Design a protein around this ligand. Structure first.
Ligand SMILES: [Cl-]
Ligand SMILES: [Cl-]
Ligand SMILES: [Cu+]
Ligand SMILES: [Cu+]
Ligand SMILES: [Fe+2]
Lengths: 157, 159
C-alpha cells in the first residue's frame, strides 16, 4: 500500500500529490535505481482538475512534465536530489523513482522528519504542442514552479 | 466542427485507434510543425485505452509517449507522403497530430480523391517511458510495433 506524503496541492490546472511505497522493478532496466538498492518508490500523482486551462480532461494524467525532486531530512540535515521518470504501474501512469533511504551509502536518510519538493516544468520543454487557434486552442502553460510537502518517514514499507 | 472521421476505428492491443482530420490548426511552439497557412488539413490519431488494458492504463485514458509514423497515399494519383504525428493538446484533450499540405503541396498529387492512410505505432518504451514489472505493482508486456490502415475520400479542407 501507498503512504501519503503531506497534503496535495492544486495549482496550474493540476492536482499534485505525493506518495511512497515499497521499491518496485522497472523496465527498461538501467534507468530507475534497482529495487534491491532502494528503500521506497516515490511517486508524483498529477492529474487534471476540472476546467484545466490547457485542455486536459478532468482526471487525465498530466504527461510530458519534467520533474525533479529534492528530499531533505530535517533532523539530520541530509539533502538529496533526483528526477522522477514517467512510467506505468497497475494503477496507471505516474512519475516515479526508486530511492535509497536507509540504504543510501551517504547516510542521514533514515527514519525521521522530511521535506519533499517537486520542481516542475511544462510539457513544451519536451516539445509537446498546444493548439492556439480560435476554434480549438488552449491557454499558455505555467512557468516552472515548485511545490513542497512535509512528512514523517517511518521506514522502508 | 467537429473532426472528419477517417475510415473505421480499430481496437487492437488494448487501445482504440481512430484517425480524424480537421482544418489546419495554429500550434505552439512555433516552428515545430508546418504553418497553418501552408497546410490544408490537420491530421490526428485518436488513441485511448480500452477497458481491461493490459499495460495498466485506465479505460479512456490517452495513450502517451507513442511513436506514430503515418503514410498517406492517394490511390488515384499514386502520391505518397510520410511523416510523424506529434503529441499535443487541444481544447478537447491530448492527441497526436500534424498539419499537412494537400492541394497546396505542388510536389505531388495530393488533391481531392481516394486515400489510404497507414499508422505505424511503436510502444512507449521506445521513448524510454517505463513500466513496473514486479509482482506487486507490475503490468503486462508492451505490444510489438504494428500498423493499422484506413481508407477515406478526401474532399478538401473543412470550411
Ligand atoms: Cl504538506
Ligand atoms: Cl478503414
Ligand atoms: Cu513507478
Ligand atoms: Cu494537433
Ligand atoms: Fe501509485
Amino acid at each position: 500500500g501507498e503512504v501519503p506524503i503531506g497534503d496535495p496541492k492544486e495549482l496550474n490546472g493540476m492536482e499534485i500529490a505525493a506518495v511512497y511505497l515499497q521499491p518496485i522493478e522497472m523496465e527498461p532496466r538501467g534507468i530507475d535505481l534497482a529495487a534491491s538498492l532502494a528503500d521506497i518508490h516515490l511517486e508524483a500523482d498529477i492529474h487534471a482538475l476540472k476546467n484545466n486551462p490547457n485542455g486536459f480532461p478532468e482526471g487525465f494524467w498530466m504527461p510530458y512534465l519534467t520533474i525533479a525532486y529534492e528530499l531533505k531530512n530535517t533532523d539530520t540535515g541530509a539533502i538529496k536530489r533526483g528526477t522522477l521518470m514517467p512510467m506505468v504501474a497497475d494503477d496507471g501512469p505516474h512519475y516515479g523513482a526508486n530511492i535509497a533511504m536507509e540504504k543510501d551509502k551517504k547516510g542521514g536518510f533514515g527514519v525521521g522528519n522530511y521535506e519533499l519538493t517537486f520542481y516542475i516544468s511544462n510539457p513544451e520543454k519536451q516539445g509537446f504542442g498546444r493548439h492556439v487557434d480560435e476554434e480549438t486552442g488552449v491557454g499558455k502553460w505555467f512557468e516552472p514552479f515548485k511545490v513542497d510537502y512535509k512528512f514523517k518517514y517511518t521506514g522502508t514499507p
